[PDB]
Design a protein around this ligand. Sequence first.
Ligand SMILES: [Ca+2]
Length: 223
Amino acid sequence: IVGGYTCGANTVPYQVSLNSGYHFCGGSLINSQWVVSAAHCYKSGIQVRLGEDNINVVEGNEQFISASKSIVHPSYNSNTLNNDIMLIKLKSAASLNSRVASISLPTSCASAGTQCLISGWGNTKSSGTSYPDVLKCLKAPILSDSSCKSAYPGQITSNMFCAGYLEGGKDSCQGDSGGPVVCSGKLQGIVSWGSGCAQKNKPGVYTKVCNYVSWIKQTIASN
Ligand SMILES: [Ca+2]
């Protein structure tokens, strides 16, 4: 997250870190057994880390649980990033508490102008690299689909939305991928892609979760 703020420990209780020896992507806890992330974060050998603040220090609220199964969306296209969503099932159920909590799925799509919370452990610089140990946060609005499409000609599908600031300076970045965009208590986006990070006229692009609720619910119901 570039241009954000330190969230505070366990203030984003649905935020998970996906670990394969190191943090590599975020995700969102949606029930005691399932995490939502980006399909482009897929890899084998994932350990889901819940209850994290400092990802390099055991602070006392963590739950580390191996993934038993990952399900990339049927229609994920890695070249365009269309349908950039996956589900990860945990080998054992998380113990839900005030610091480890699921986030609700949307019932309707969000609208341009709604202010959302974006979070992660990704790069905090837009020229240069610095990776934080503690969780970072950014409050940002959803942008209109017309401004999103004009920012990224030929690239924005109906399964994507833009959020952030056209003036630059505030955005998600490398290492935030797969993490949450939460608006009014609902998971509306997944950190997906962008041109660089925090660049003028280049807002963040996010997977449009509301399009996937049916798939998510049916997948959980049979897996
Ligand atoms: Ca920790």
